[PDB]
Design a protein around this nucleic acid. Structure first.
Ligand SMILES: [Mg+2]
Ligand SMILES: [Mg+2]
Ligand SMILES: [Mg+2]
Ligand SMILES: [Mg+2]
Ligand SMILES: [Mg+2]
Ligand SMILES: [Mg+2]
Ligand SMILES: [Mg+2]
Ligand SMILES: [Mg+2]
Ligand SMILES: [Mg+2]
Ligand SMILES: [Mg+2]
Ligand SMILES: [Mg+2]
Ligand SMILES: [Mg+2]
Ligand SMILES: [Mg+2]
Ligand SMILES: [Mg+2]
Ligand SMILES: [Mg+2]
Ligand SMILES: [Mg+2]
Ligand SMILES: [Mg+2]
Ligand SMILES: [Mg+2]
Ligand SMILES: [Mg+2]
Ligand SMILES: [Mg+2]
Ligand SMILES: [Mg+2]
Ligand SMILES: [Mg+2]
Ligand SMILES: [Mg+2]
Ligand SMILES: [Mg+2]
Ligand SMILES: [Mg+2]
Ligand SMILES: [Mg+2]
Ligand SMILES: [Mg+2]
Ligand SMILES: [Mg+2]
Ligand SMILES: [Mg+2]
Ligand SMILES: [Mg+2]
Ligand SMILES: [Mg+2]
Ligand SMILES: [Mg+2]
Ligand SMILES: [Mg+2]
Ligand SMILES: [Mg+2]
Ligand SMILES: [Mg+2]
Ligand SMILES: [Mg+2]
Ligand SMILES: [Mg+2]
Ligand SMILES: [Mg+2]
Ligand SMILES: [Mg+2]
Ligand SMILES: [Mg+2]
Ligand SMILES: [Mg+2]
Ligand SMILES: [Mg+2]
Ligand SMILES: [Mg+2]
Ligand SMILES: [Zn+2]
Ligand SMILES: [Zn+2]
Ligand SMILES: [Zn+2]
Lengths: 98, 127, 81, 96, 214, 153, 91, 25
RNA sequence: CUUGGAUUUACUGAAGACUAACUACUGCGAAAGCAUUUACCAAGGACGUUUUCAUUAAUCAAGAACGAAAGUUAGGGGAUCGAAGAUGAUCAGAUACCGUCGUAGUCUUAACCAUAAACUAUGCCGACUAGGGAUCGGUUGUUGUUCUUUUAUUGACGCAAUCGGCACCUUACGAGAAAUCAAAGUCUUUGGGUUCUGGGGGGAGUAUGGUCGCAAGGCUGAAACUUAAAGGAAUUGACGGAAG
């Protein structure tokens, strides 16, 4: 039977969406279907943010961030626990996790 | 004040390059890779190998007169991954803890404005 | 609402309806008498005019057509007929 | 746009089509405008505008060839040049 | 076997007077020998230094300047402007979702015949009283803004020499004028000249260059 | 006869004595009878004009190009072929061009060429279909056809 | 009536030379015997002489063209490219 | 077997029948 | 692949592709599809309209136009990936998955092909039946808001209506075997108009004839024979080299 009303993608009123390659396995996946996560991480791990600030030649220099947008296909994301299997009724919930 | 070089760190998932040049980048001062510190291929990109590689780089810098460096970290880029390898974080901390002074830090990963086909095929690499 | 006076809708709610969706369809447009500031000559102008109307005396554009109602130029006063 | 104005003159006014009629119409001073096709030979062109300079007649240079000038006038033949004798319901003379 | 660093001679890099802290740093090259002079193989080098370093202030931390050496006087290197660029992280921090990104570029030559390509970038501004999630501008307005960018960069470059323009880039004169000039089109934020490239240089004039070094 | 490219006969005046000089140029496509041909350093970029290589910007399509200054045309003379100007070296007065074989050549910037593509192109697209057609083709070229295979002697 | 279903002008060649050579010949041989529009007088009276030679019967102007068409695509591309490059050079 | 490969098997087998029948043309 | 200096580094140049980030349960198109700027060319829906014509219309065998990718023919291009092929591994075996090379192809110009899970597995036109909040395009009334420029005749934003779209949320009058459905409702209380298709499972989209195609193949399309099930949705369990 039909498992999801959205067919696992985000294509409505559209014929074709150009594909993207998965970061993990380089599989061609439609842009609307890919599981996308935006991550803004510190470029230096919190253990080294002190000694690198002390080693800085600049007083009060702010470390730049690392901006990245990751694209995954369905097999990579499920395997890497980026998304998880939800119950039949819990699948419908599409608000971001709290 | 300080005498700056440029530490061009290329951290892939198979190796870690610690490469210090001058300001122009046309003159190479020290290039120690994580593969020169281990005899196993599987840990050429290990954080441990990158730390040893950075210390050898820092030691070479001191005897030439380089007292501070700017950091230009990069990943493989191109059609491949844009996140830096595990050795890039260790080589930066090792350089700072070795008495070398740190200047500007920048990510200089080459990023296409949409470009060539990536290896692996349509169905990806099946594992 | 099961019981409702369809033959005598409230004139307030009747005016919010689309022009084709009233009991009897009726245009919301009208005709205006336009006084340009320069002179005084009655000129009948449609509210939703599609033409750059010019008064006979001086060849000055009175209004510019838009998507909906025509826009009267500055100094031009209108009175609905 | 100028084509729409010219079509009305052909429909309502008076005109002559062709090089021999245009030169005759320039001699008599009955021409209000001379229209020359883009692919008209330059020698004929530079001669038509010498007659128009003498006749004191403005000249409009059609952008298409004599194949396109003929069909604008509603004709099934080629028109290398034409003269407008009477602009009628149109306002082509006021638009050069 | 030979330790190639025994034959290196150190030189000092001097920035033009348009900046404040003109002592950029030091470089090295193989020592001048009979066959090859150190001077000729040293000119043409490009140094990429942060604009915050050339001015002290951290407000220029997101711009980095390329300096091209084209005259050597003993141990001093006389550099010139070679290009402008933003840091990668600054641009990535400006490109958010639920908003429109607009870019423009134009090729234009200065008064002294320096051919440049100048890249402008801007983003739609969310109004203080705005309620809707996204801030999108209609494509017709974006075409007018893009057109407005191009005619401002063309005007403010062709009317001045490269040195005055360098003094224009530091305070975002062009970016502030674009923001002011597009107020009646659409509210804008983060209007920046994010990159400048030198394409073609005029015939070398050492005297003109020397005036930019004191 | 013997050429795929048509030839153009162009009449010039003699600058020093009262006489007409008829030249035989290779016709570029688009050149017509009665057309004015301009030749020299100051000639304009029009089809059929003869210009020095330095006066033509990159990407200019040119034919009958001089290999050496004053040899009156050596390169790109057959039907459908041409030379693309790749770039200039004004300090050494040299120009880089791309030849019909795909080779890049460096020629003096004073060498001349004719603007356009040699007329008659697309000739090879049609099969000859007959031995007689090749016989008539080589009847006005030279005695090189037909060829006996060396393995059959 | 319609005399040949598909050979057309290549019916003069009978059954010889192979279908691929005959249909490839037919395409290019219709073009070389066609009448083209004259850019000078406007009539469709231009016909080929030898290869590269296209004459107009009316105004007697001869223009150098392609082997089988009055103008090739490469020349048309060069004509607009030269026109475009001419505008920049002459401002 | 897979429906797609069953179709390919028959397509290749249809090809053989046509070539075999052509012998007695 | 590397002391014949690889990999790396800075600067420079050349080729082809491709247009990241902005990019969304957003837009446009009959569908396939469409994402750098500008210029040119001709189109298009919606909205507005006290403009115009008056049944011109709805759906449509036959027949046309278009029709992803791959593929065919001939030129041109051939950066990157990469069928075939070659190779290093793995394995009991592995012609494969993984790794390294790589030819057609991938791009383009002239023609062919006419097929895709070409999907919404859901024909089109018309009417009605229920609430709600968003959003795109247009129109009409109106702000403790920001801004042109100092304000308007700037533009943005805010609040209401409305027509049209892409969708979404709730309910079930109602439908259904259920999964589910604002249509898949207004169907034993059975009839608004109209086009196409199916009749247990296989054999089989097979054989044959016809027709289109250069070919690969496309369209139309049986019979003999065989069988009591095959299948759909859901429930419990069992199992899973799935998650918590
Ligand atoms: Mg399932
Ligand atoms: Mg649509
Ligand atoms: Mg599709
Ligand atoms: Mg699709
Ligand atoms: Mg998804
Ligand atoms: Mg490795
Ligand atoms: Mg390695
Ligand atoms: Mg080792
Ligand atoms: Mg492979
Ligand atoms: Mg797996
Ligand atoms: Mg005529
Ligand atoms: Mg405006
Ligand atoms: Mg010769
Ligand atoms: Mg012989
Ligand atoms: Mg032989
Ligand atoms: Mg032979
Ligand atoms: Mg013998
Ligand atoms: Mg007969
Ligand atoms: Mg047999
Ligand atoms: Mg090297
Ligand atoms: Mg949009
Ligand atoms: Mg883009
Ligand atoms: Mg049909
Ligand atoms: Mg295709
Ligand atoms: Mg195709
Ligand atoms: Mg193809
Ligand atoms: Mg080919
Ligand atoms: Mg290739
Ligand atoms: Mg490869
Ligand atoms: Mg293989
Ligand atoms: Mg084996
Ligand atoms: Mg196809
Ligand atoms: Mg689908
Ligand atoms: Mg709206
Ligand atoms: Mg009111
Ligand atoms: Mg304004
Ligand atoms: Mg405006
Ligand atoms: Mg039955
Ligand atoms: Mg049956
Ligand atoms: Mg059978
Ligand atoms: Mg056939
Ligand atoms: Mg039984
Ligand atoms: Mg089941
Ligand atoms: Zn993947
Ligand atoms: Zn008036
Ligand atoms: Zn003619």
């Amino acid at each position: 039977p039909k498992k999801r009303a959205s067919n696992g993608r985000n294509k409505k009123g559209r014929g074709h969406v150009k594909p993207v390659r998965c970061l993990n396995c380089a599989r061609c996946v439609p842009k609307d279907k890919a599981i996308k996560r935006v991550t803004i991480r510190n470029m230096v791990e919190a253990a080294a943010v002190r000694d690198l600030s002390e080693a800085s030649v600049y007083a009060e220099y702010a470390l730049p961030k690392l901006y990245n947008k990751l694209h995954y296909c369905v097999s990579c994301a499920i395997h890497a626990r980026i998304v998880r299997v939800r119950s039949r009724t819990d699948r419908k919930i599409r608000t971001p996790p709290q | 004040s300080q005498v700056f070089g440029v530490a061009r760190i290329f951290a892939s998932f198979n190796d870690t390059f610690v490469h210090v040049t001058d300001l122009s980048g046309k003159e190479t001062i020290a290039r120690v890779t994580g593969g020169m510190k281990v005899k196993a291929d599987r840990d050429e990109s290990s954080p441990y190998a990158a730390m040893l590689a950075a210390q050898d780089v820092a030691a070479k810098c001191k005897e030439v007169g380089i007292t501070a460096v700017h950091i230009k970290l990069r990943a493989t880029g191109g059609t491949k991954t844009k996140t830096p390898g595990p050795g890039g974080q260790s080589a930066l901390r090792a350089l700072a803890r070795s008495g070398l002074r740190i200047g500007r830090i920048e990510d200089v990963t080459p990023v296409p404005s949409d470009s060539t086909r990536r290896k692996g095929g349509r169905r990806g690499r099946r594992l | 609402v099961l019981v409702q006076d369809l033959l005598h809708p409230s004139p307030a709610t009747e005016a919010k309806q689309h022009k084709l969706k009233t009991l009897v369809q009726q245009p919301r447009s009208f005709f205006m008498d336009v006084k340009c500031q320069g002179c005084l000559n009655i000129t009948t102008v449609f509210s939703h005019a599609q033409t750059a109307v010019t008064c006979d005396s001086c060849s000055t554009v009175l209004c510019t057509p838009t998507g909906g109602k025509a826009k009267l130029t500055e100094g031009c006063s209108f009175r609905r007929k | 746009n100028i084509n729409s104005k010219l079509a009305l003159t052909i429909k309502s006014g008076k005109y002559t089509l062709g090089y021999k009629s245009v030169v005759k119409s320039l001699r008599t001073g009955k021409a209000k405008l001379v229209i020359i096709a883009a692919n008209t030979p330059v020698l004929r062109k530079s001669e038509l505008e010498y007659y128009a300079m003498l006749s004191k007649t403005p000249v409009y240079y059609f952008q298409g060839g004599n194949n396109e000038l003929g069909t604008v006038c509603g004709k099934l033949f080629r028109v290398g040049t034409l003269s407008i004798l009477d602009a009628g319901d149109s306002d082509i003379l006021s638009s050069i | 076997v030979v330790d190639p660093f025994t034959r290196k001679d150190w030189f000092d890099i001097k920035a033009p007077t348009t900046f404040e802290n003109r002592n950029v740093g030091k470089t090295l090259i193989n020592r001048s020998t009979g066959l090859k002079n150190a001077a000729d193989g040293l000119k043409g080098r490009v140094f990429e230094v942060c604009l915050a370093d050339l001015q002290g202030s951290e407000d220029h931390s997101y711009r980095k300047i390329k300096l091209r050496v084209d005259e050597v006087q003993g141990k001093n290197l006389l550099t010139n402007f070679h290009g402008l660029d933003f840091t990668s992280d600054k641009l990535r921090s400006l490109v958010r979702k639920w908003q429109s990104l607009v870019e423009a570029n134009v090729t234009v030559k200065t008064s002294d015949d320096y051919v440049l390509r100048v890249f402008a970038i801007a983003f739609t501004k969310r109004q203080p009283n705005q309620i809707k999630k996204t801030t999108y501008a209609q494509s017709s307005k974006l075409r007018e803004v893009r057109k407005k960018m191009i005619e401002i960069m063309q005007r403010e470059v062709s009317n001045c020499t490269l040195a005055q323009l360098t003094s224009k880039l530091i305070p975002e004169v062009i970016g502030r004028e674009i923001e002011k000039s597009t107020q009646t089109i659409f509210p804008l934020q983060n209007v920046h000249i994010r990159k400048v490239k030198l394409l073609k240089q005029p015939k070398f004039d050492l005297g003109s260059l020397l005036a930019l070094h004191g | 006869p013997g050429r795929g490219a048509p030839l153009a006969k162009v009449a010039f005046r003699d600058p020093y004595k009262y006489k007409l000089r008829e030249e035989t140029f290779i016709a570029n496509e688009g050149v017509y009878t009665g057309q004015f041909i301009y030749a020299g350093k100051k000639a304009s970029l029009n089809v059929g004009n003869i210009l020095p290589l330095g006066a033509c910007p990159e990407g200019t399509i040119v034919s009958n190009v001089e290999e050496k200054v004053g040899d009156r045309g050596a390169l790109g003379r057959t039907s459908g072929n041409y030379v693309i100007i790749i770039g200039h070296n004004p300090d050494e007065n040299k120009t880089r061009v791309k030849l019909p074989s795909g080779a890049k050549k460096i020629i003096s910037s004073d060498a001349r060429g004719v603007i356009g593509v040699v007329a008659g192109g697309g000739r090879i697209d049609k099969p000859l279909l007959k031995a007689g057609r090749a016989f008539h083709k080589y009847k006005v070229k030279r005695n090189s056809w037909p060829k006996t295979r060396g393995v059959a002697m | 009536t319609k005399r040949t279903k598909k050979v057309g002008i290549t019916g003069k060649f009978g059954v010889r030379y192979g279908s691929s050579l005959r249909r490839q010949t037919k395409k290019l041989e219709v073009q070389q015997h066609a009448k083209y529009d004259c850019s000078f007088c406007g009539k469709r009276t231009v016909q080929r002489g030898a290869t590269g030679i296209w004459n107009c019967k009316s105004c007697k102007k001869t223009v150098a063209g392609g082997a089988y068409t009055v103008s090739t695509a490469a020349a048309a591309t060069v004509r607009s490219t030269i026109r475009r490059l001419r505008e920049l050079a002459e401002a | 077997m897979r429906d797609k490969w069953r179709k390919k098997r028959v397509r290749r087998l249809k090809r053989k029948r046509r070539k075999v029948r052509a012998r007695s043309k």
